[PDB]
Each structure stands twice: as C-alpha cells, then as structure tokens.
Design a protein around this ligand. Structure first.
Ligand code: CHL
Ligand code: CHL
Ligand code: CHL
Ligand code: CHL
Ligand code: CLA
Ligand code: CLA
Ligand code: CLA
Ligand SMILES: CCCCCCCCCCCCCCCCCC(=O)OC[C@H](CO[C@@H]1O[C@H](CO)[C@H](O)[C@H](O)[C@H]1O)OC(=O)CCCCCCCCCCCCCCCCC
Ligand SMILES: CC1=C[C@H](O)CC(C)(C)[C@H]1/C=C/C(C)=C/C=C/C(C)=C/C=C/C=C(C)/C=C/C=C(C)/C=C/C1=C(C)C[C@H](O)CC1(C)C
Ligand SMILES: CC1=C[C@H](O)CC(C)(C)[C@H]1/C=C/C(C)=C/C=C/C(C)=C/C=C/C=C(C)/C=C/C=C(C)/C=C/C1=C(C)C[C@H](O)CC1(C)C
Ligand SMILES: CC1=C[C@H](O)CC(C)(C)[C@H]1/C=C/C(C)=C/C=C/C(C)=C/C=C/C=C(C)/C=C/C=C(C)/C=C/C1=C(C)C[C@H](O)CC1(C)C
Lengths: 222, 50, 221, 243, 222, 44, 35
C-alpha cells in the first residue's frame, strides 16, 4: 500500500507536514522522520541506514532470545533461577554446574567465560571484518547491507516487488524489536524482574501494576 | 447495567449472607484471566461455560 | 605507512573496500575508521580532528598523572595522604589540606574556592588564547593544533617528515591514553580501587581477579 | 464552510422534511440570518426588518444569557467542591450583601480575595458602567482606548460598524476575517445563546421548584436519577408502596 | 543596537578572543554568539533543525524553570498547601495522594485522581498540538515554523521588525538561561535531594560550606 | 489413591488445557496451517 | 492418557484449522455460477 515514493505514510499521519527533502521514500522504513537532521548529507545517511538495519537485526535476535528462555522456564524447561531471566543469565557460567543449554547438562556445559569470549571475539571478528570488507572467499560482488546469495538460502528476495515489501517488513519488525529491547533494558533496571514476569504482574492487575507504580522508587533523598 | 450495579442501588445478590439482598457491588472482577476464562471454559458438567 | 593510500588501517585485510572517501590518509591518525559517518563533512571533520587532538593531549597528561602518585606510593614509598586518584581531590578537605608530595611545606592548600578561582582564571585565559589563535600581536601566525612557536622550544619538528611521523606518534599515544583513561574511569566505578591496585590484584590471581569477577555488581534487584 | 446547512433554501429547519413542507416556512425567514430554522409559529415576526429588530434583541439576550449561565453554574459548583465562596447559589448571592455583608471573589485558580466593596458602591459602579456602555452601544461611538488586536484606537473606529457585530476592537483575536467562518461562527453564537437562554429559564424554574441551585440539581440527580427528579420532588413525602 | 546582536561586529562567545568564528555563523539568526566548536551546525539544513530544536527547548525550559520554582515559593509557613509536592521532583507523586492533586491546595481546583487518565488526556492534546506545530492546523497553515505570530501573537509587540529582532534575541537569551537553570535544577536535585529554593536559602545561610563541594564525595565508589 | 488420573474434569481449565504442552501443540498446529495458507495465499 | 490427549488435541486442531482456512481460502469464489 504505497510503501515508497512521495505518497508513502509518514510518522505523524496527516499531521506530518512536508517530509525533509533528503527523505524521498527510496529506502525501506521511510516515514519522513529526521527531525534532528542527522541524516542530512547522503554519506552519513547511508551509514545511518546500515547502522539502523544492523541494530534492527541484532535486536530482533535479542528480543527473541530475551523472551525465549523465560517462556521455556515458565513452561517447564529446567532453567534453574538465573538462566530463566536474561539479565541474570550471564552469571550462570560462574555456577559450579555451569551454563547448560536448555538446562540439559549434556548440552554445552560451559564454565570458562574467557574461552567463550575468546571464541566469540575471533568468530565475530572474522564475520564483521567480512561484512565491512563486503567480500569473502566465497562471497563476491554482493550488496553490503542486503547480500543474499548464501544469505538468502530459500530465495525469498527474487522478485523485486516482494523484495521491497520484505525490506519494509524487516525494518518495521526490527524497529519494533529495538523499541522492545529498550523496554527490556529499562524494565530490568526499574522493576528488577524479567519482562515476562512484568507482563504477568500487569495482567494480574493493570490498574496498579504499571510503570507509575515504580515512579517513586528513584527519587533523590535529602 | 454496570452503573446501576455500582451506584444506582445495586442489584439483587442471591449469595448475600442470610438469604440474599440487594447489594452494591464494590470491586468488580476486572481481571482478564478470570473474565475470559469463562468464555473458553468447556460447556459440559461441572464447567458450564459462561 | 600511516599516510597515503597504502597506510595502516583499522581492520587490516578488511579495510580495502570500506574506507570512506573523505579519509584519504592526509591527516595523522587516519586509519580509515569512520563507521557512523560523523566526519563526512570537511568542516565537521576538522572540528572533530582538533577536538580529538586536544582530548588526546589532555588524556596523555591525565594518564600520566593518574598513575604517578600511586606508583610512587606503591614502590617508591612516597606518602601522599591519598594516592588513589579518584579520592585525591578530597585531600583539600582534610585536616592537613593538600600537600604536594606529602610533605606539608610544598603546597598546603586548604581553599577549594581559591584554587578553583585561580584555575578558572588561568585556564580561561589560556583556552581563550588557544581558541582566538593569539591576542593581536601575541602569535597570530601559528597553527591551531601545532603552534610551534614557544610550544616547541626544543625543535623536535625541524624536518617535515619527522614532524609528520611525530604527529602520528602523538595521535597514537593520545588514543592509547584516552582508551586507558576510559579504563581508569570504568575500573574506578566497578571496583572502588585504584588502577595500580587493580593491576596488583590481577597479577596476584589472573584467572580470578578479572573484570568478569565484577560482572554481577550492578545487577538490579 | 458548509454554509448550505444554515443559509439559503436548503438549510436546517425546526421540523424535518416529512413534517414540514418548504411552502410552510414564513416568507420573512428565508435563510439570510444565522439560526434561521424557519421557526415563527405564532407570527411574532412580520417582515424582514421586524425580524432584524427582534434579532438585535435576541442577540443581546443570547450573549447576556451565555454569561449568566456560566456565572450561575460555576460559583455554586466551586462552593460545593470546597471553594471559600458565599452565595454560590445564584438566587442567594444578593442577600449575602444586605446588612453590610460582602462577597468573596475566587479568581481561578489563584485564590479567594475578599471584596471590600459594599452593596451601594457595587450598584453605583454597575449603574454608571452599564449605562455608559449601553449608551455607547446605541450611539455607535466610544471615548477611544486600547485593544489587544487593533491597537490604541481613536473614537472614529466605531463608525461604519454593524451595531450587532461590531468586531474590530471587540475582536482582538480576529477569527472572523474570513466571511465563511464569520457566518458559521454567527450560527454557533446564536445556537449557543439560545441554548443558554433555555438553560437560564430552566435554572430559574428549577430553583423555584426544588429550592436549590442547578449544580445541586444536576449532582443529586446524577447521583440518584430515579430517586431525585421533578416527579419525586413534586411527590414530596416518599410514597405509600403499592405492593 | 542590532549590530550588538547581529552582523559581523555582534557580541561573541569569547568577547575579544573569538576572531575565528565559524564561517557559517554569519550573524543572521537570533543569538549567534559564534559558538560551534564541534561543527555540528556546519551543514545548513542541520543548523536549521538545531535552531528550531533549540528554540523549542528554550521555551519549554522557560516554562519548566518557572514551574519548578513557583510552587516552592508559594509554600505557606507550615506545609499545608503543598506537602512534599511543594518540591518539583516530588510533585508527580501528589496525584497518588488520597485527596488527589489539588491545584494550589484548593480541593475545588482540578482534584485529579487518575494518573493514567491525565496522561492519556495529555498524550492526545500534546500530540494534536505538536502535529499542528509541524504541519499546520486551526491556528495557522503556512506560517513560520518557529515564529507563527498570528494567533500566538495576540498582543502585538512584534509588528515592528526592529522590535521583533531584539525580542528574538531576548527570547533566545532568556531561554538559554532557563535551559542552564533547568540543567542546574536536575543536577542539584540528583546530588542534594532538596528543592532549588531550599538549596538557595541553604547557600545564603553560609556560602563558605553550603556549596556543591560539600557533596563532592557523594558518588565515590567503594 | 489406588491409581493415577489426570483429574481435569471440571475445574474450568481454559480449552481443557491441564498441561501447557496442550496449549503449545494447539498453537503450533494452528500456526503451521496458517503459515502454509499464508505462504500459499495469492493462489487459488 | 496425557499422550492420548495430546494426540487427540493435535488431530482436532489440525482438522479444525483445515476447516477454518479452507473457508478462508476465497470460498465464495468456488462455484460454477456467473458472478
Ligand atoms: C517531561 C519531563 C519530566 C521530568 C524531568 C520528570 C521527572 C520526574 N517525575 Mg514526572 N517527570 C516528567 C514528566 C512527567 N511526569 C509525569 C508523572 C509523574 C508521576 C505520577 C510521578 C513523577 C515523578 C517524577 C520524578 C521521579 C523521581 C526520580 O528521581 O526520577 C528520575 C529523575 C531524576 C533523578 C531527577 C533529574 C531529572 C533529569 C535527569 C531529567 C532530564 C532528562 C529527561 C529524562 C528528559 C527526557 C525526555 C522527556 C520526554 C522525559 C522525577 C524527578 C514521581 C515523583 O515525583 O516521585 C516523588 C511520580 O510519582 N512524574 C507526567 C504525566 C502527568 C509527565 C509528563 O507528561
Ligand atoms: C573574555 C573571556 C571569556 C571567556 C574565557 C569565556 C568563556 C566562556 N563563555 Mg563567554 N567567555 C568570555 C567572554 C564572554 N562571553 C560572553 C558571552 C557568553 C555567552 C552568551 C555564553 C558564553 C559561554 C562561554 C563558555 C563556552 C565554552 C565552554 O563551555 O567551555 C567549557 C568550560 C570548561 C571545560 C571549564 C571547566 C572548568 C572546571 C574547573 C570545571 C569544574 C570541574 C569540577 C570541579 C569537578 C567535576 C568533575 C566531574 C566529577 C564532573 C565559556 C566557559 C557559553 C556557556 O556555555 O555559558 C554557560 C554561553 O552560552 N559566553 C561575553 C559577552 C558578549 C563575553 C565578553 O567578553
Ligand atoms: C438584572 C437581573 C437580576 C435578577 C434576575 C435578580 C434576581 C434576584 N435578586 Mg437581584 N437580581 C438581578 C440583579 C441584581 N440584584 C441585586 C441585588 C440583590 C439583592 C441585595 C438581593 C437580590 C435578590 C434577588 C432575588 C429575589 C428578588 C432574585 C433571584 C435577593 C436575594 O438574593 O434573596 C435571597 C436579595 O436580597 N438582588 C443587584 C445589585 C443592586 C443587581 C444588579 O443588577
Ligand atoms: C467604547 C467603550 C465600550 C465599552 C467599554 C464596552 C463594553 C462592553 N460592550 Mg460594547 N462597549 C463599548 C462600546 C460599544 N459597544 C458596542 C456594541 C456592543 C454590542 C453589540 C455588545 C457589546 C457588549 C459589550 C460588553 C462585553 C464586551 C467586552 O469585551 O466586555 C468586557 C470589557 C472589556 C474587556 C473592556 C473593559 C476595559 C475598559 C474599557 C474598562 C475597565 C473596567 C474596569 C471596571 C476598570 C461590555 C460591557 C456585548 C454585551 O453586552 O454582551 C452581553 C454586546 O453584545 N457592545 C458599540 C457599537 C459599535 C460600541 C461603540 O462605541
Ligand atoms: C433507528 C431509528 C431511526 C432512524 C435511523 C431514522 C432516520 C431518519 N429519520 Mg426518523 N424516526 C424514528 C426513528 C428513526 N429515524 C422515530 C422513532 C421517529 C418518531 C419520533 C421518527 C420520525 C421521523 C420523522 C417524522 C421524520 C424522520 C426522518 C428521518 C431522517 C432525517 C431526520 C432524522 O434523523 O430524524 C429526526 C428525529 C428526531 C429529531 C428525533 C430525536 C432523535 C434523537 C437523536 C433521539 C436520541 C436517540 C437515543 C440514542 C435514544 C434512543 C431511544 C431508544 C433506546 C428507544 C432519517 C432518514 C425525516 C424524513 O425522512 O424526512 C423526509 C422526517 O420527517 N424521522
Ligand atoms: C481582551 C480584552 C482587552 C484588554 C485586556 C484590554 C486592555 C486595556 N484596555 Mg481595553 N477595551 C477592549 C479590550 C480589552 N482591553 C474592548 C473590547 C473595548 C471596547 C471597544 C475596550 C476599550 C478601551 C477603552 C475605552 C480604554 C481601554 C483601555 C485599556 C487599558 C486599561 C484598562 C484597565 O486597566 O482595566 C482593566 C481591563 C481589563 C480588560 C482587565 C488596558 C491596557 C484604556 C486605555 O487604553 O487608556 C487610554 C481606555 O481608556 N480599553
Ligand atoms: C522571556 C521570554 C520570552 C520572550 C522575550 C519572548 C519573545 C518573543 N516571543 Mg515567545 N515564548 C515564550 C517566552 C518568550 N517569548 C515562552 C515561554 C513560550 C511558550 C509558551 C513562547 C512561545 C512563543 C510563540 C509560539 C511565539 C512567540 C513569539 C514571540 C515574539 C513576540 C513578542 C513577545 O512574546 O513579547 C516578549 C515576551 C514577553 C514580554 C514575555 C515576558 C513576560 C511575561 C508576561 C511572563 C509571563 C509568565 C507566565 C506567568 C508564564 C505562563 C505562560 C503560559 C500561560 C503559557 C517575541 C520574539 C511569537 C512571534 O514570534 O510572533 C511574531 C510566536 O508566534 N513565542
Ligand atoms: C457453544 C460452545 C460453548 C463453549 C465454547 C468453548 C468450547 C471449549 O472451550 O471447549 C473446550 C473443551 C475442553 O476439553 C475438556 O475440558 C475438560 C474440563 O477442563 C477436561 O480438561 C478435558 O480433559 C478436556 O478434554 O474441549 C472440547 O471438549 C472440544 C473442543 C473442540 C471442539 C471442536 C469443534 C469442531 C467443529 C467446528 C469448529 C469450528 C470453528
Ligand atoms: C529516527 C530518529 C530521527 C529523529 O529526528 C532523531 C532521533 C530521535 C535520533 C531518531 C530516533 C532514534 C531512535 C529511536 C533510536 C533508538 C534506537 C534503539 C532503541 C536501539 C536499540 C537497539 C537494541 C538492540 C540492538 C538490542 C539487542 C539485544 C541483544 C543483542 C540481546 C542480547 C542478549 C540476549 C539475547 C539474552 C541474554 O540473556 C542477554 C543478552 C546477551 C543481552
Ligand atoms: C573513531 C570512531 C569511528 C566512528 O566515528 C564511530 C565512533 C565510535 C564514534 C568513533 C569512536 C570514538 C571514540 C572511541 C571516542 C572515545 C573518546 C574517549 C575515550 C575520550 C576519552 C578522553 C579522556 C580524557 C580526556 C581523560 C583525561 C583525564 C584527565 C584530565 C585526568 C585528570 C586527573 C588527574 C590527572 C589525576 C587526579 O587525581 C584526578 C583527575 C583530576 C581526574
Ligand atoms: C552551543 C554548542 C556548540 C558547541 O560547539 C557544541 C555544544 C557543546 C553541543 C553546544 C552546547 C550545547 C548546550 C549548552 C546544550 C545544553 C542544553 C540544555 C541545558 C538543555 C536543557 C533543556 C531543559 C529543558 C527543556 C527543561 C524543561 C523542564 C521542564 C519541562 C520541567 C517540567 C516540570 C515542571 C514545570 C515542574 C514539575 O514539578 C516537574 C516537571 C514536570 C519536571
């Protein structure tokens, strides 16, 4: 429904006014929102677009991985007490039983955080160096931000129209996931509980179990 | 109906102690789990749906 | 090397195809690292370069001055009153005030108001002079980042390529000092101990006394 | 805009199409005044200029009754909700200033100020101010002054002004420069004023019947509709149950 | 007098020690002391966005500083009008009081009970207002984005362009002072836990030791 | 007791779900059919 | 017995979903009429 061009929907609806001239609707997720003017020249606009999409994909994975073990623990998967919730799941590798995937001590059973971090550093350094270089020993001449090929095994991005629609879907889901991950961070800081527990408390009593209930817990004392 | 029961004399509670009486309902059950558990309850004996 | 198109870059074998067009290896410290595109505009690039250089020199001074009164209290046995840098400023609130090397005959300052007033006056005049680039007769013909007149009294920059390589040395040293100062700040926050104490504990037990040992300090309750 | 609903031959009438054929509307009401619903059942208007004179009377009444409705309903509600106000009930405020009594004026939301003016000073000031203002209105000429819109105006700014809709100094915020918005705001003015006139008559008759002000009436009725209404207060003693 | 705040000989942010004003700060816009040491406003469109945002922040901070100072000044001799809510950073919790938020302590004013309801009303109203400011609405359609001055200038005072320019300078300078004061309010609240007027009177009691250095060891780590 | 029972008759269980695996298999089967229908949607 | 309940729930959900999305699959268009 006109996700590109000068008839695209904008970020204040009919109250949007005229969008900035550099936001012409060429790129996915254009709602005419650069009120700070940070994307005014095209070089940093392109850099901000790749930064936004990388953040969006990372936050999609992060939101799914923040939700999933809490739901599994509430559905009977034996996460003990801290692997259940995301902002304490890191400490499990210091437990003498170790960090076991899905609570199964046969899976992973990791205890050396330094070894885990070193493996992550080397693997992600190779991967992000490849992404920055825009090339790999088997990947040559692809888009830096939408590579495809081996990164599109099932070939969903073959028709250009479907590709543009899926690009809009990806950026909108990723922005929702970034919004929800910011929510996860702030809710963990404020409430001190997992997001699923926050949702369950709110469903238990929405009138009094909300953020305003925690509005007085950070006030500075004389 | 809600306004009648809350402010305008209440409605007849047959479960009022002593044989039932007209009662003002205070704190109606607004819990979504309790409210929507009626509509997904089975209609058979001992459950009766809504 | 550190200049031109064949220069050292910030991702090595991964840098040849994503170096920004505006990073041509003209200025020192150009490893091609601009991923957010903050210095795409030339004027903003110049302002960011000068801000980085001022920060680098301030961080070189700060990294030397954070470690010196704690190394001297560690091995040299010099008494200070408070060797720990993030507790140093409170010395002026003590009974003996702030004595420079520890001995009460050096400074013995007891007025934070007076020392702040003197610092504000001196630093304001100095930074106004640096920003103005002179005072209409007091060196209006010097460079904004590398003045070179009475700021290079020993003349280490006589040869232009020596000057360029010394700029590279200065910017790499300053970036190392900025990284180390951020480390100083974060270590202070997460340990409550000086950097020398942190290094001593780490050398005492590497696999135990490390940052992950403080990974659960700021967990919310 | 959309002025066809209020002006011309296809405007809104006081009866719908199936009850009022448009050969039953009087000829002196043909949709050039605001609020023309074709409503003159008793023929108190006769021709266009009789309608104009009665519209002068209607517009002055409408504005006075809008001010009156606000000033009747607001102080009583403030007093009942806790403002230090005496005589908040609209038909009791006069007796509060009889034997040297004063009034408290609550400037919202800043606070109550005790008004030191006695009844004689109040009535003298009101008589002279209202007499001067109504003389100015009927003459179309004033002693000059300042307005927030057009600035320090001379005494000649009132010349050539419609007496009913002067504007200018009386329009500091404008909002009537466009003729279409001026016409529809005239319609809004006359409808609001007629509603306020009906409301003030309601206030008077309700106050006479129930012995209390309209805020008390609306609050007690909205707190017990079937237990507090006209028929209940006409009943008086509760009722002998039918059973 | 315009030369005092406009043109090349205007007042600058370092007095006589500011001859290297950035070339894009040409003394055209209100304020313009030649202060841009980071080059954030080198791009003209981003400079326009920054000017709009600065003026909006300036007006918000004028209102905010006045609203943060006013109820503490209007406190009585016994704290009966306003309780803890006399202090601005404790004002919001007033809506959780049993009598609700009564304006100026009078229960006939506002008497607001439901924070969710007042927040929803504010979201609707402020969304409509900001949409009008961006796009155009009941109070204007194509006026200036920063100085519409038709419905929002009821009293005149700006028909003369000279008075308009000097009042623009007055507005931006008062707004910058108010922004500085609001940042001071935030930092003072965080580091002291007392109201700004309480801080002022405490300082006036004995300025030698009633100062920020008396709290200089507050956030020290252990 | 002499034998084991699910003990689910009555008690008002939503969709008769006495174990969350039942809700999960309901959601999974419905979602799988929906996903098949949705990928095969501009088709007749 | 719980395994039997899980299997029966899966079977019933499968057939009900087939029914629902079958009538969702443009069913008023599957007729030999003109129009
Ligand atoms: C727009 C700015 C704004 C600011 C700065 C505050 C600040 C505050 N509110 Mg608050 N509110 C604001 C808007 C609104 N509040 C409320 C409704 C409430 C309630 C109901 C309550 C508060 C409370 C509080 C305080 C929480 C205690 C604390 O230490 O918190 C953290 C704050 C500080 C440490 C002080 C320094 C603030 C400074 C860092 C702010 C500057 C950065 C901002 C976050 C700007 C971000 C953008 C905007 C959109 C927020 C706090 C000082 C509570 C209170 O008073 O408890 C005693 C409380 O109960 N607010 C509404 C809806 C009516 C608002 C807007 O619509
Ligand atoms: C003649 C010399 C002169 C000097 C030196 C300055 C200097 C300054 N003017 Mg100024 N002005 C001068 C003349 C004039 N000004 C103005 C009009 C203005 C305006 C209108 C404004 C300024 C502003 C500024 C400031 C902008 C730079 C800045 O923020 O630096 C950074 C400053 C520092 C880094 C100093 C830090 C000192 C340090 C001791 C701080 C304290 C540290 C703590 C004790 C420890 C805490 C550490 C950790 C824990 C946080 C700056 C301090 C602007 C401003 O920011 O105002 C508030 C501004 O808006 N000036 C006029 C009238 C035309 C002048 C006329 O001569
Ligand atoms: C212009 C219309 C107007 C109307 C409809 C009323 C109506 C009323 N006045 Mg009133 N007054 C009016 C104007 C004025 N009154 C007063 C001064 C008083 C007094 C002093 C008293 C009334 C009282 C009354 C009531 C009984 C008569 C009645 C409801 C009496 C009252 O309130 O009885 C309870 C009463 O004692 N009025 C002044 C100032 C001189 C007025 C000026 O315009
Ligand atoms: C020149 C002075 C002059 C004054 C003071 C008034 C005052 C008034 N006229 Mg009036 N008029 C004046 C001239 C004229 N009027 C009219 C035609 C009308 C009409 C048709 C109507 C009015 C109405 C009104 C009243 C409401 C308007 C208003 O803003 O009220 C509040 C008053 C002010 C904001 C200004 C007061 C400031 C200062 C002059 C006096 C300060 C008083 C303090 C006690 C001190 C009000 C009492 C309306 C009315 O009666 O509604 C019920 C109404 O319908 N006038 C004409 C013919 C073109 C005038 C010609 O000179
Ligand atoms: C749901 C029923 C309904 C609907 C949608 C309509 C719709 C219409 N009627 Mg109406 N009509 C109805 C009921 C209805 N009628 C009833 C019950 C009456 C008897 C009082 C009439 C008698 C009537 C006449 C005689 C005329 C119309 C005509 C019209 C047309 C325009 C004028 C108008 O709105 O009526 C105007 C009606 C009123 C002003 C009555 C008051 C309406 C308010 C809104 C009542 C508030 C309703 C509220 C929700 C409470 C409902 C009570 C309920 C619980 C029992 C329009 C097509 C006109 C027409 O066709 O002209 C050619 C015409 O001449 N109507
Ligand atoms: C929004 C309404 C508004 C505002 C705030 C002003 C403001 C002003 N008027 Mg007024 N005035 C206006 C509309 C208004 N008027 C209208 C509608 C009329 C009728 C045409 C007048 C006619 C007028 C005259 C006759 C005089 C003023 C004058 C005054 C000044 C003193 C009045 C005073 O202290 O009494 C308080 C008044 C309040 C509204 C409060 C004041 C600056 C005086 C002036 O300028 O002195 C030369 C004066 O002589 N006014
Ligand atoms: C002291 C600060 C100050 C000053 C100097 C100005 C100056 C300017 N503004 Mg304003 N502005 C201010 C604050 C200020 N503003 C605030 C806080 C807001 C947000 C409410 C605005 C919103 C605003 C808009 C939306 C517009 C302007 C316009 C104007 C111009 C018209 C002249 C004028 O306002 O008279 C100078 C101002 C004063 C003399 C006011 C100072 C004294 C007052 C009486 C204090 C009032 C305090 C009050 C109790 C706080 C509650 C206010 C609340 C009701 C909103 C002028 C350039 C208009 C314009 O450019 O038209 C061409 C325009 O469209 N401004
Ligand atoms: C009128 C219907 C009133 C009840 C509505 C809710 C029904 C309900 O929740 O059932 C829920 C019940 C509950 O199921 C039973 O519940 C008991 C009490 O909790 C026990 O737990 C039993 O173990 C459990 O099987 O499931 C059923 O019995 C059958 C549901 C499947 C019906 C398939 C109909 C297929 C036909 C058309 C589908 C069209 C779409
Ligand atoms: C547009 C615009 C325009 C205008 O004008 C201006 C402005 C305003 C600037 C703008 C805006 C902006 C924004 C909104 C931003 C935001 C962002 C975000 C939020 C991000 C996030 C983002 C986020 C993210 C990434 C996230 C991610 C996450 C993750 C990974 C996670 C992970 C994890 C997990 C799984 C679990 C475990 O247990 C833990 C961990 C390990 C932790
Ligand atoms: C390149 C890039 C690319 C794209 O753009 C993207 C991005 C990412 C953005 C980028 C990056 C950036 C960065 C890295 C930044 C950083 C910075 C820093 C760290 C600084 C510091 C900095 C730091 C510093 C100065 C510091 C300094 C220090 C000092 C002075 C000290 C002082 C002292 C002393 C002596 C001692 C005592 O007792 C205390 C005190 C008093 C305290
Ligand atoms: C120029 C330049 C250039 C170079 O080169 C670079 C740089 C450095 C970047 C620069 C600078 C900048 C700056 C200075 C900034 C700052 C700003 C601010 C401070 C703002 C505030 C701002 C501020 C603001 C808005 C504020 C506002 C406030 C408010 C609303 C308040 C409210 C309130 C009130 C009433 C009361 C209650 O009870 C509470 C509350 C609710 C709380």
């Amino acid at each position: 429904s006109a996700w590109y061009g000068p008839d695209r929907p904008l970020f204040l609806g009919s109250l949007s006014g005229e969008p900035p001239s550099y936001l012409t609707g060429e790129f996915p997720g254009d709602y005419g929102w650069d009120t700070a003017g940070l994307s005014a020249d095209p070089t940093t606009f392109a850099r901000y677009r790749t930064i936004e999409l990388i953040h969006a994909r990372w936050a999609l994975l992060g939101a799914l991985g923040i939700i999933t073990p809490e739901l599994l623990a509430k559905n009977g998967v034996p996460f003990s007490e801290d692997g259940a919730i995301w902002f304490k799941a890191g400490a499990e590798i210091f437990k003498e039983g170790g960090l076991n995937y899905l609570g199964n001590e046969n899976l992973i059973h990791a205890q050396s955080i330094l070894a885990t971090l070193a493996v992550q550093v080397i693997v992600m350094g190779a991967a992000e160096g490849f992404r920055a270089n825009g090339e790999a020993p088997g990947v040559e001449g692809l888009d830096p931000l939408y590579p495809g090929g081996p990164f599109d095994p099932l070939g969903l991005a073959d028709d250009p129209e479907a590709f543009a629609e899926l690009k809009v879907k990806e950026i909108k889901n990723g922005r929702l996931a970034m919004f929800s991950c910011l929510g996860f961070f702030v809710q963990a800081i404020v409430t001190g509980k997992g997001p699923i527990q926050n949702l369950q408390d709110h469903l238990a009593d929405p009138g009094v179990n909300n953020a305003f209930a925690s509005a007085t817990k950070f006030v500075p004392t004389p | 109906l809600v306004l009648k029961a809350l402010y305008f004399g209440g409605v007849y509670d047959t479960w009022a102690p002593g044989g039932g009486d007209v009662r003002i309902i205070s704190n109606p059950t607004t819990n979504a789990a309790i409210i929507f558990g009626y509509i997904v309850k089975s209609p058979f004996g001992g459950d009766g749906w809504i | 090397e550190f200049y031109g198109p064949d220069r050292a870059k910030f991702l090595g074998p991964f840098s040849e195809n994503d170096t920004p067009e505006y990073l041509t290896g003209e200025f020192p410290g150009d490893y091609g690292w601009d991923t957010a595109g903050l210095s795409a505009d030339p004027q903003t690039f110049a302002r960011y370069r000068e801000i980085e250089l001022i920060h680098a020199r301030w961080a070189l001074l700060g990294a030397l001055g954070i470690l010196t009164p704690e190394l001297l209290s560690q091995y040299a046995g010099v008494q200070f009153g408070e060797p720990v840098w993030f507790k140093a400023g409170a010395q002026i609130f003590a009974a003996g005030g702030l004595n420079y090397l520890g001995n009460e005959s050096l400074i013995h300052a007891q007025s934070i108001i007076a020392t702040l007033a003197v610092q504000v006056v001196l630093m304001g005049l100095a930074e106004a002079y640096r920003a103005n680039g002179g005072s209409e007769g007091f060196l209006d013909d010097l460079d904004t980042l590398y003045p070179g007149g009475a700021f290079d009294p020993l003349g280490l920059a006589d040869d232009p390529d020596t000057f360029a390589e010394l700029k590279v040395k200065e910017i790499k040293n300053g970036r190392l000092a900025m990284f180390s100062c951020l480390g100083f700040f974060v270590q202070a926050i997460v340990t409550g101990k000086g950097p020398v104490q942190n290094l001593t504990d780490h050398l005492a037990d590497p696999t135990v006394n490390n940052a992950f040992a403080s990974a659960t300090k700021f967990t919310p309750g | 805009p959309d002025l066809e609903k209020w002006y011309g031959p296809d405007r809104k009438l006081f009866l719908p199409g199936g009850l009022l054929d448009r050969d039953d509307v009087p000829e002196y009401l043909n949709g050039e005044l605001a609020g023309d619903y074709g409503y003159d059942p008793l023929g108190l208007g006769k021709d266009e200029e009789q309608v104009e004179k009665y519209r002068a009377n209607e517009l002055l009444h409408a504005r006075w009754a809008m001010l009156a409705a606000a000033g009747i309903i607001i102080p009583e509600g403030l007093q009942a909700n806790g403002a230090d106000i005496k005589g908040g009930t609209w038909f009791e405020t006069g007796a509060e200033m009889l034997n040297g009594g004063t009034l408290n004026y609550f400037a919202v939301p800043f606070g109550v100020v005790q008004n030191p003016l006695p009844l004689a000073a109040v009535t003298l000031i009101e008589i002279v101010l209202l007499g001067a203002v109504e003389k100015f209105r009927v003459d179309g000429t004033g002693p000059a002054g300042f307005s927030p819109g057009v600035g320090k105006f001379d005494s000649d700014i009132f010349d050539g002004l419609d007496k009913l809709y002067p504007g200018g100094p009386f329009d500091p915020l404008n909002l009537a420069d466009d003729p279409e918005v001026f016409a529809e705001l005239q319609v809004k003015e006359i409808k609001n004023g007629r509603l306020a006139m009906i409301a003030v008559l309601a206030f008077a008759i309700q106050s006479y019947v129930t012995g209390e002000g309209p805020y008390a009436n609306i609050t007690k009725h909205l707190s017990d509709p079937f237990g507090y209404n006209l028929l209940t207060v006409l009943q008086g003693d509760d009722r002998v149950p039918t059973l | 007098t315009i030369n005092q705040f406009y043109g090349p000989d205007r007042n600058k942010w370092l007095g006589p020690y500011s001859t290297n004003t950035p070339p894009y700060l040409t003394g055209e816009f209100p304020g313009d002391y030649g202060w841009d040491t980071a080059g954030l406003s080198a791009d003209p469109e981003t400079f326009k966005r920054y000017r709009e945002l600065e003026l909006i922040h300036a007006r918000w901070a004028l209102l905010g500083a006045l609203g943060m100072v006013t109820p503490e000044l209007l406190q009585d001799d016994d704290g009966i009008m306003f309780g803890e809510s006399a202090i601005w950073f404790k004002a919001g919790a007033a809506i959780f009081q049993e009598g609700g938020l009564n304006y100026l302590g009078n229960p006939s004013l506002i008497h607001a009970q439901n924070i969710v309801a007042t927040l929803a009303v504010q979201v609707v109203l402020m969304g409509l207002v900001e949409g009008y400011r961006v796009n155009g609405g009941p109070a204007g359609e194509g006026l200036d984005p920063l100085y519409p001055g038709e419905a929002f200038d009821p009293l005149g005072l700006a028909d003369d362009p000279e008075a308009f320019a000097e009042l623009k300078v007055k507005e931006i300078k008062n707004g910058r002072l108010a922004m500085f004061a609001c940042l001071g309010f935030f930092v003072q609240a965080i580091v002291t836990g007392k109201g700004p007027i309480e801080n002022l009177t405490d300082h006036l009691a004995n300025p030698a030791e009633n100062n920020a250095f008396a709290y200089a060891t507050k956030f020290t780590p252990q | 007791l002499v034998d084991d029972r699910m003990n689910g008759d009555g008690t008002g269980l939503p969709f008769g779900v006495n174990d969350g695996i039942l809700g999960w298999v309901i959601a999974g089967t419905l979602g799988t059919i929906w996903a098949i229908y949705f990928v095969s949607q501009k088709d007749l | 017995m719980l395994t039997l309940k899980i299997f029966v729930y899966t079977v019933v959900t499968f057939f009900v979903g087939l029914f629902i999305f079958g009538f969702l699959s443009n069913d008023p268009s599957r007729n030999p009429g003109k129009g």
